[PDB]
Design an enzyme around this catalytic site. Structure first.
Site, PDB file in Angstrom:
ATOM      1  N   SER A 100     -16.845  19.773 -18.520  1.00  0.00           N
ATOM      2  CA  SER A 100     -16.676  19.897 -17.081  1.00  0.00           C
ATOM      3  C   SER A 100     -15.709  20.972 -16.589  1.00  0.00           C
ATOM      4  O   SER A 100     -14.882  20.731 -15.714  1.00  0.00           O
ATOM      5  CB  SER A 100     -16.310  18.531 -16.490  1.00  0.00           C
ATOM      6  OG  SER A 100     -15.888  17.635 -17.501  1.00  0.00           O
ATOM      7  N   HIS A 158     -20.841  23.895 -11.722  1.00  0.00           N
ATOM      8  CA  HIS A 158     -21.647  22.716 -12.007  1.00  0.00           C
ATOM      9  C   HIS A 158     -20.924  21.382 -11.769  1.00  0.00           C
ATOM     10  O   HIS A 158     -21.571  20.343 -11.621  1.00  0.00           O
ATOM     11  CB  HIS A 158     -22.247  22.787 -13.409  1.00  0.00           C
ATOM     12  CG  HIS A 158     -21.372  22.223 -14.478  1.00  0.00           C
ATOM     13  ND1 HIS A 158     -20.798  23.001 -15.462  1.00  0.00           N
ATOM     14  CD2 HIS A 158     -20.993  20.952 -14.743  1.00  0.00           C
ATOM     15  CE1 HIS A 158     -20.091  22.239 -16.273  1.00  0.00           C
ATOM     16  NE2 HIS A 158     -20.190  20.987 -15.855  1.00  0.00           N
ATOM     17  N   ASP A 186     -21.905  30.042 -13.584  1.00  0.00           N
ATOM     18  CA  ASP A 186     -21.318  28.733 -13.482  1.00  0.00           C
ATOM     19  C   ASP A 186     -19.826  28.837 -13.193  1.00  0.00           C
ATOM     20  O   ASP A 186     -18.998  28.717 -14.097  1.00  0.00           O
ATOM     21  CB  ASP A 186     -21.552  27.999 -14.794  1.00  0.00           C
ATOM     22  CG  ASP A 186     -21.246  26.524 -14.697  1.00  0.00           C
ATOM     23  OD1 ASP A 186     -21.010  26.006 -13.579  1.00  0.00           O
ATOM     24  OD2 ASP A 186     -21.249  25.892 -15.756  1.00  0.00           O
TER      25      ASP A 186
END
Length: 390
Positions: free
Chosen positions: A336, A192, A248
């Site tokens: 993140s 992502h 992810d």
């Protein structure tokens, strides 16, 4: 037949035939012992022929034996050469030892690293023969020990900072990410972080040109002692879904590989087991997410069911995911893809178990708002397959 005089054999060799007296038209071969070649006029030879001329003279004087020289031994990669003696002899019978650079690299097979200069002028190892040993990177052994606290140099050596500068947009669109070193040329992160933002649902990897990765960075303000590399390649997991963040996970290949150091080493990947880290087990997470220094926190893994059902009142926490966090201050350093690392038992090395995928929009510490992590043990085969390992 007028007689030629007697011959002294050269140091380190013999003559044949050796006889008492030699007369007109006699032939002799001077040759050298195993470690040596006959030297004459700068040519080296295995044998040299001498003849007894009419006038009682020999065709040549008896030449000399040169010892065999294997010259400079081939240099080893991430390794170094120690000569058996401060003389650093490279001639016959001389001995050298190859060692890998520690503690960043370790030598394969624990091959001795012992090469000796052979009669044929070749550096020889009893097993490897002419072939050199192999230095492989050592992973998951930080050069500092563990003392939302601040982070000291060399604490999280695998910690990478990803900086994306999308210059195809006006103005430049810029964001940051977190990465974990897998080897000198590879960084692991969340898909992502590398997804190009857009209004449709189609998944586009950001451009490789817009990516730069820093290693050995603690204070963004002090890029000194910092390693920086552009991206050879950007690889999102092919099944990544931007909608619920399934799968992810992603890699960045480094164009210019980084020098392993005391502040730069990779983390080890998890064995390929199916279960999520046992509940209550404690991991580390380090990131900036904002802050200028790097920080880390201890976090406990949270029973899968409980997390999943909490995220039932709005998406879905799958079996490719696990949760960490407490049920209710600031222990959320990561939006993140920062790694969730756990010190392994047996191996005694730090293992990346998780990549931070998502979490509730709620306030950090908010009731039962657990961080959700990509389960890295479910993608290692895929990870090695990208790295060519496999």
């Amino acid at each position: 037949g007028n007689e030629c005089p007697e011959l002294q054999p050269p140091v380190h060799g013999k003559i044949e035939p050796s006889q008492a007296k030699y007369f007109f038209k006699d032939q002799v071969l001077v040759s050298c012992d195993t470690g040596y070649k006959v030297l004459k006029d700068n040519v080296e030879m295995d044998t040299f022929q001498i003849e007894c001329l009419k006038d009682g003279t020999w065709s040549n004087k008896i030449p000399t034996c040169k010892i065999v020289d294997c010259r400079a031994p081939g240099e080893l990669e991430h390794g170094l050469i120690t000569f058996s003696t401060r003389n650093n002899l490279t001639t016959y019978k001389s001995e050298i030892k190859y060692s890998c650079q520690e503690p960043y690299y370790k030598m394969l097979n624990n091959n001795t690293g012992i090469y000796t200069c052979s009669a044929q002028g070749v550096w020889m190892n009893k097993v490897l023969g002419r072939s050199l040993p192999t230095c492989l990177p050592e992973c998951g052994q930080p050069s500092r020990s563990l003392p939302g606290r601040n982070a000291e140099p060399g604490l999280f050596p695998w910690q990478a900072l990803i900086v994306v500068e999308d210059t195809s947009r006006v103005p430049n669109d810029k964001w940051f990410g977190s990465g974990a070193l897998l080897s000198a040329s590879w960084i692991l992160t969340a898909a992502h972080v590398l997804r190009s933002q857009r209004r449709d649902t189609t998944v586009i990897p950001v451009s490789k040109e817009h990516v730069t990765v820093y290693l050995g960075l603690h204070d963004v303000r002090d890029k000194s002692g910092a390693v920086n590399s552009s991206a050879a390649r950007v690889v999102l997991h092919p099944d990544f879904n931007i909608q619920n963040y399934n799968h992810d996970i992603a890699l960045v290949q480094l164009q210019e590989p980084v020098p392993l150091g005391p502040h730069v080493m990779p983390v080890c990947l998890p064995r390929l087991e199916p279960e999520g880290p046992a509940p209550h087990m404690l991991g580390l997470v380090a990131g900036w997410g904002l802050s200028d220094v790097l920080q880390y926190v201890k976090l406990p893994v949270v029973p899968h069911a409980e997390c999943k059902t909490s995220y039932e009142s709005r998406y879905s926490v799958t079996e490719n995911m696990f949760c960490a966090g407490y049920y209710e201050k600031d222990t959320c350093l990561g939006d993140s893809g920062e790694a969730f690392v756990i010190f392994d038992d047996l191996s005694q090395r730090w293992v990346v178990q998780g990549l931070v995928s998502w979490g509730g929009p709620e306030e950090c510490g908010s009731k039962q708002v657990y961080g959700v992590y990509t389960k890295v043990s479910n993608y290692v085969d895929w990870v090695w397959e990208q790295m060519g390992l496999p």
